Amino acid sequence: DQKPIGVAVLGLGNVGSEVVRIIDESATDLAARIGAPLQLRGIGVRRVSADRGVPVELLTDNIEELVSRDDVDIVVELMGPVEPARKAILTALEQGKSVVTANKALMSVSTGELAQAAEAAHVDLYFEAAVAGAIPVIRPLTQSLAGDTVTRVAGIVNGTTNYILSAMDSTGADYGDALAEASALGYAEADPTADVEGYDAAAKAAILASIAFHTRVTADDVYREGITKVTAADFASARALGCTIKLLAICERLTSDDGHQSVSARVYPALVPLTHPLAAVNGAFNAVVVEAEAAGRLMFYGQGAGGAPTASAVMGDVVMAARNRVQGGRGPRESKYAKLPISPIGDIPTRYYVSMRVADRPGVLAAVATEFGNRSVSIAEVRQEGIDPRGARLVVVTHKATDAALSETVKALASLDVVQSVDSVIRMEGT
Amino acid sequence: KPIGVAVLGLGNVGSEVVRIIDESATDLAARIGAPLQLRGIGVRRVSADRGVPVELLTDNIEELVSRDDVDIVVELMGPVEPARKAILTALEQGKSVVTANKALMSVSTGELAQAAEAAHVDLYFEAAVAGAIPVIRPLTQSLAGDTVTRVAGIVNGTTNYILSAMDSTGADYGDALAEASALGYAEADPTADVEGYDAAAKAAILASIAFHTRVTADDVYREGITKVTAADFASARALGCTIKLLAICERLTSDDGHQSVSARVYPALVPLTHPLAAVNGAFNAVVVEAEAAGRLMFYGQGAGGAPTASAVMGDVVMAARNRVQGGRGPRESKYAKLPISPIGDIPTRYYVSMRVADRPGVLAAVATEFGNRSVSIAEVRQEGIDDARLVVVTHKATDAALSETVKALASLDVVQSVDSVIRMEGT
Ligand SMILES: NC(=O)c1ccc[n+]([C@@H]2O[C@H](COP(=O)([O-])OP(=O)(O)OC[C@H]3O[C@@H](n4cnc5c(N)ncnc54)[C@H](OP(=O)(O)O)[C@@H]3O)[C@@H](O)[C@H]2O)c1
Ligand SMILES: NC(=O)c1ccc[n+]([C@@H]2O[C@H](COP(=O)([O-])OP(=O)(O)OC[C@H]3O[C@@H](n4cnc5c(N)ncnc54)[C@H](OP(=O)(O)O)[C@@H]3O)[C@@H](O)[C@H]2O)c1
């Protein structure tokens, strides 16, 4: 006696369309892998029409009725908005329905209330598709690395910003021309703000940090800096220093001198040495680096955006949720046991690349050096040359120090007389 | 209530496992929901010079796996028959089992999985494939809603360290293998590695996990690196390639719709621009191609006591979580019953290095031999030796045709000897 498992898909856009196509075209495999048939009950949408690749009788705009049906077992939330999403997720869990979602912004703001609700109803809540599109990242960090100690999660989690920077690195194009080409070729949107400013990265970083270090981290905890201040000159200096530039999401388990642990989650442009694995990740692809104590360095690479790869991840969650209902017993449980404090950006040890225009006098380098040393910052590399009998281009790369000390050093350099301007400031990671 | 652990086996993996159970007790207990307590360590030679408290050591494996205060049995013994025996007894006693045995999983999963499903109990084996790289769980759970078509890459740390050394230093196979054994990257009898048994067992497991069918080691074509020379790497560099021990697992589809599976491990010239060409040292890398997901790559350490212990502990936490929360893992799904495609049917390319007569006619003879079996040549290089060296690279063609041509070449009068024959993948 194998009772079918009902599925309600909310959304028929880029991801939902692919999810429904798979539930259709792979029904035999899916059923065989779940143990019972996987039967689509209805599709939540706003526009109901016969021109949506599905029979209209499946389409509905009443989402609350669709997730409330008794012959529905799993609810797949693939609508954009967060308030409709949360309302659907909650009403569905309350009725004992397993939930699969891909909603970055909802998960990055509070998995606490939703996870508690799924635990109460004794049902699953899977959101693998929320981070890294098709790249399995959440399940490896919650299950495969559960017996280990993760210390660093870092990688490229935004395809648009990686395509733009990869393009600036290859062609020497200016940011504006690279963004234009990106928009034209369909890699960026009419308003790419969520990408180029780093909001998409910050949300994903909050989720990754929470999963990796067993603490609650929200998008509001993540320091955010985008790529709009990255220039072609920056890439030229980076190349001269053996680096490229990438928009990194970094999640670190930090330890202070007094021994207490904390968690950092931050996104910003970073000079990355060409030898680093992330430097070879180009185009719109994503890659996630995980440092653990017993396992060492792991890297997961693939497509972290798109209807088809995201659907792959959704369907993996769906099959697991259906399997759990067939055999009884849920999947993992929320592990936020650590209650680690959040380290702000100023406490984080990092390195600064600083590019300035300075007077072409033999004492200026001593002046800037003192400004770094007076705050206990050591200099690793310096490059100085003239511009065309007027001034000099002074590049400085520091050793590691707190972002606070380096931020204050920069402010100081700006106020110096010999410093005409501080043209660029970019952190440096990898090394 | 506590969860009892029994580690069968010590050494590289078992030592790290025990050390982690002790040093990470607080985190492990708080991630499981109940304390994780080591009950005993199975071993053959019981003594006090094994870096672990002696009271824990015991040579009666059957007693250890049958204890009531045990709950998970971590099998980390070498041989397959004592492993199968202990696994079965532990499962029949209602104990979840975590193993890392490649040879046991690659020869027979049927009886073991059935015994575990009957006793409503887990049988995890992530540590069997790719050391620390999580590969089995992604293919069994994350990609379960997808259709995987190809799984391939570097899955042996020892062979990969030897070849990488041969590529960096120009060393001969014997010297590199000695460096590896001396530095601890290989072992006293590296036969399991250098001849391909390790890779072929892992490939059997990968194919069966990815294509939802039963694939055993007896179905995997196996060729090692013992015949890879420094002169091979010199040619490969000249041809814009390196050499790597590749495992490949493909879902093949015919014109009529018949599906089949091919699983094969062998040496291969790979272009330097290929991603696998950058996987050096003892690292591994697994590439998965699926219909929705597209292409994925998993990179990490594939050999080592601590990396493999990491995978083992991942499975132990999950098996302990399940026993606390009353559940299980994904049932074994080998429903496709796909037939096995032999090697002759697989399209590939050959690099063939020969010593031939130093006369201007030999090239036409070798070419006709290739052509009469409908094989186009992509590149040739010919020069003289000092008291003629002929290198040929073919286009794609079936392994069977290429084998027939090689035989024909060896039997040719103008061909003094076939010195090296290596496939070429990637491209
Ligand atoms: N696209 C990607 O590459 C990607 C990657 C990772 C994660 N995700 C996440 O996946 C989710 C879906 O993205 P998508 O690209 O599929 O979005 P989409 O293309 O904009 O489609 C959204 C779908 O949801 C429906 N919908 C929206 N608001 C609704 C509401 N209030 N009530 C009922 N139905 C509603 C829409 O119906 P109508 O067509 O009638 O308006 C449409 O079918 C989002 O949370 C996104 O963050 C997407
Ligand atoms: N080593 C690696 O890097 C690695 C990586 C991935 C997977 N693996 C897998 O992990 C497993 C263990 O490998 P390993 O390198 O840890 O091996 P190992 O160094 O050779 O240790 C084997 C252990 O098993 C015990 N043992 C052997 N035969 C036994 C028997 N009949 N009854 C009871 N105990 C027995 C031995 O005890 P005594 O010392 O008293 O003889 C020893 O402690 C293998 O299945 C291997 O394929 C290993």
Among A118, A139, A40, A130, smallest CA distance to A82 is for A130
Nearest CA to ligand 2 atom 31: B82
Among B71, B1, B74, smallest CA distance to B35 is for B1
| Partner-chain contact B293 A277, CB within 8 Å | no
Q: Which residues contact A262 (CB under 8 A, 6 or more apart)?
A: A253, A254, A255, A256, A340, A341, A342, A343, A347
- Contact of B63 with B28, CB cutoff 8 Å: no
Classify the phi-psi angles of A247: left when phi > 0, otherwise alpha if psi is within -120 to 50, otherwise beta. beta
Tell me whether residue A428 is exposed, middle or buried, using C-beta atoms within 10 angstroms of its C-beta: 0 to 12, 13 to 18, 19 or more: buried
Q: How far apart are CA A196 and CA A210, in angstroms?
A: 24
- Both structure tokens of A329: 């017993």
Among B180, B203, B219, smallest CA distance to B286 is for B203
- Both structure tokens of A98: 């397993």
| Partner-chain contact A318 B145, CB within 8 Å | yes
A18, A59, A67, A79, best to mutate for ligand 1 pocket (most atoms within 8 Å of CB): A79
| Cα dihedral value B346, B347, B353, B359, nearest 10 | 120
Q: How far apart are CA B329 and CA B322, in angstroms?
A: 8
Which of A:140-159 have CB within 8 Å of B?
A: 140, 143-149
Cβ-count burial B185-198 (b if 16+ within 10 Å, e if not): bbeeebebbbbbbb
Q: How far apart are CA B185 and CA B202, in angstroms?
A: 19
Q: How far apart are CA A288 and CA A305, in angstroms?
A: 14
Q: How far apart are CA B115 and CA B89, in angstroms?
A: 9
Token pair 């001198």 is found at: A257
| Partner-chain contact A327 B328, CB within 8 Å | yes
Q: How far apart are CA A267 and CA A157, in angstroms?
A: 10
Q: What angle do CA A414, A415, A416 make, to 5 degrees?
A: 95
Q: How far apart are CA A376 and CA A366, in angstroms?
A: 15
Q: How far apart are CA B294 and CA B297, in angstroms?
A: 10
Interface-testing mutation among B146, B147, B323, with chain A (most A C-beta atoms within 10 A): B146
- Contact of A127 with A85, CB cutoff 8 Å: no
Give the gap in angstroms from C-alpha B134 to the nearest C-alpha of chain A: 6
Tell me whether residue A336 is exposed, middle or buried, using C-beta atoms within 10 angstroms of its C-beta: 0 to 12, 13 to 18, 19 or more: middle
- Contact of A237 with A353, CB cutoff 8 Å: yes
Cβ-count burial A18-49 (b if 16+ within 10 Å, e if not): bbbbbbeebeebbbebbbbbbebbbbbbeeee
Task: State the DSSP string of A369-391.
Answer: HHHHHTTTPPEEEEEEEE----E
Tell me whether residue A57 is exposed, middle or buried, using C-beta atoms within 10 angstroms of its C-beta: 0 to 12, 13 to 18, 19 or more: exposed
Q: How far apart are CA A405 and CA A403, in angstroms?
A: 6
Q: How far apart are CA B105 and CA B135, in angstroms?
A: 15
SS3 category, B114:
helix
- Contact of A328 with A3, CB cutoff 8 Å: no
What percent of chain A is helix, strand and coil (3-state, nearest 5)? 40, 25, 35
Among B249, B213, B197, B207, smallest CA distance to B110 is for B213
Among B342, B51, B339, B326, smallest CA distance to B215 is for B339
Task: State the DSSP string of A55-104.
Answer: -GGGEES-HHHHHH-TT--EEEE--S-HHHHHHHHHHHHHTT-EEEE--H
Cα A182 versus chain centre, distance? 20
Please give the single-letter amino acid code of residue B231.
A
Please identify which of the residues A3, A87, A204, A336 carries the catalytic annotation.
A204
Token pair 């491990």 is found at: B265
Cβ(B184) to ligand 2 under 6 A?
A: no
- Both structure tokens of A325: 């209902």
| Partner-chain contact B331 A317, CB within 8 Å | no
SS3 category, A127:
coil
Q: Is B95 considered catalytic here?
A: no
Q: How far apart are CA A15 and CA A309, in angstroms?
A: 9
SS3 category, B143:
coil
Q: Chain A partners of B143 at a C-beta cutoff of 8 Å?
A: 136, 312, 316
B15, B41, B44, best to mutate for ligand 2 pocket (most atoms within 8 Å of CB): B44
Q: Which phi and psi angles does B131 have, rounded to 5°?
A: 50, -115
Q: Chain B partners of A146 at a C-beta cutoff of 8 Å?
A: 31, 313-314, 317-318, 321
Cα A291 versus chain centre, distance? 16
Q: How far apart are CA B419 and CA B416, in angstroms?
A: 9
How many other β-carbons are positioned within 10 Å of the β-carbon of residue B62?
12
Q: Which phi and psi angles does A365 have, rounded to 5°?
A: -60, -35
- Contact of A272 with A243, CB cutoff 8 Å: yes
Distance in Å, CA A79 to ligand 1 centroid = 4
- Both structure tokens of A410: 């920069």
A262 touches chain B (CB under 8 A): no
The closest CB to that of A33, out of B144, B298, B306, belongs to B144
CB pairs under 8 A between A and B: 184
Handedness of CA A209, A210, A215, A221 (dihedral sign): positive
Please give the single-letter amino acid code of residue B183.
L
Q: How far apart are CA B212 and CA B259, in angstroms?
A: 12
- Contact of B77 with B9, CB cutoff 8 Å: yes
The closest CB to that of B310, out of A280, A292, A333, belongs to A292
How many other β-carbons are positioned within 10 Å of the β-carbon of residue B359?
10
Q: How far apart are CA A116 and CA A333, in angstroms?
A: 9
How many other β-carbons are positioned within 10 Å of the β-carbon of residue B168?
12
Tell me whether residue A64 is exposed, middle or buried, using C-beta atoms within 10 angstroms of its C-beta: 0 to 12, 13 to 18, 19 or more: exposed
Among A428, A154, A162, A416, smallest CA distance to A291 is for A154
- Both structure tokens of B58: 């015991």
Cα A268 versus chain centre, distance? 11
- The DSSP code for B45 is S
End-to-end CA distance of chain A: 59
- Both structure tokens of B261: 């599976």
Q: Which residues contact B274 (CB under 8 A, 6 or more apart)?
A: B426
End-to-end CA distance of chain B: 56
Distance in Å, CA A16 to ligand 1 centroid = 7
Q: How far apart are CA B201 and CA B189, in angstroms?
A: 17
Give the residue numbers of the binding site of B for NADPH: 102
Among A33, A39, A4, smallest CA distance to A20 is for A39
* Strand (E) or helix (H) holding B78: none
| Partner-chain contact A301 B306, CB within 8 Å | no
Cβ(A13) to ligand 1 under 6 A?
A: yes
Give the residue numbers of the binding site of B for L-homoserine: 187
* Pairing label, strands B241-253, B148-154: antiparallel
Token pair 């002759």 is found at: B344
* Approach to solving: X-ray
Q: How far are the Cα atoms of A430, B101, B143, B422 from residue B263, in angstroms, in the given order?
A: 37, 19, 19, 17
Cβ(B7) to ligand 2 under 6 A?
A: no
Cα A127 versus chain centre, distance? 14
Among A71, A69, A10, smallest CA distance to A43 is for A10
Q: How far apart are CA A69 and CA A41, in angstroms?
A: 9
Q: How far apart are CA B385 and CA B407, in angstroms?
A: 23
Ligand 1 atom index nearest CA of A130: 7
Tell me whether residue B278 is exposed, middle or buried, using C-beta atoms within 10 angstroms of its C-beta: 0 to 12, 13 to 18, 19 or more: middle
Please give the single-letter amino acid code of residue B419.
D
Handedness of CA A413, A419, A420, A423 (dihedral sign): negative
- Both structure tokens of A409: 């050093």
Closest chain A residue to B313 measured between Cα atoms?
A: A147
Q: How far are the Cα atoms of A248, A290, B144, B148, B340 from residue B290, in angstroms, in the given order?
A: 27, 23, 11, 4, 20
SS (H, E, C) A389-414: CCEEEEEEEECCEEHHHHHHHHHHHH
* Pairing label, strands B415-424, B377-383: unpaired
Among A99, A54, A71, A68, smallest CA distance to A4 is for A71
Among B40, B34, B55, B31, smallest CA distance to B10 is for B40
Count of all residues that appear for chain A in the document: 431
Q: Which phi and psi angles does A119 have, rounded to 5°?
A: -65, -40
Cβ-count burial B123-156 (b if 16+ within 10 Å, e if not): bbbbbbbbbbbbbbbbbbbbbbbbbbbbbbbbbb
Q: Which residues contact B57 (CB under 8 A, 6 or more apart)?
A: B40, B41, B43, B46, B47, B50
Side-chain-side CA neighbours of residue B172 (13 Å): 2
- Contact of B297 with A302, CB cutoff 8 Å: yes
Q: Chain A partners of B315 at a C-beta cutoff of 8 Å?
A: 147
Give the gap in angstroms from C-alpha A23 to the nearest C-alpha of chain B: 9
Among B392, B119, B157, smallest CA distance to B286 is for B157
Q: How far apart are CA B338 and CA B260, in angstroms?
A: 5
SS (H, E, C) B360-373: CCHHHHHHHHHHHC
SS3 category, B74:
strand
Among A10, A209, A211, A239, smallest CA distance to A102 is for A10
The closest CB to that of A22, out of B126, B145, B312, belongs to B145
Domains of chain A: 1-134+303-338 (3.40.50.720), 135-302+339-346+428-431 (3.30.360.10), 347-427 (no CATH)
- Contact of B310 with B126, CB cutoff 8 Å: no
* Experimental structure resolution, Å: 2.6
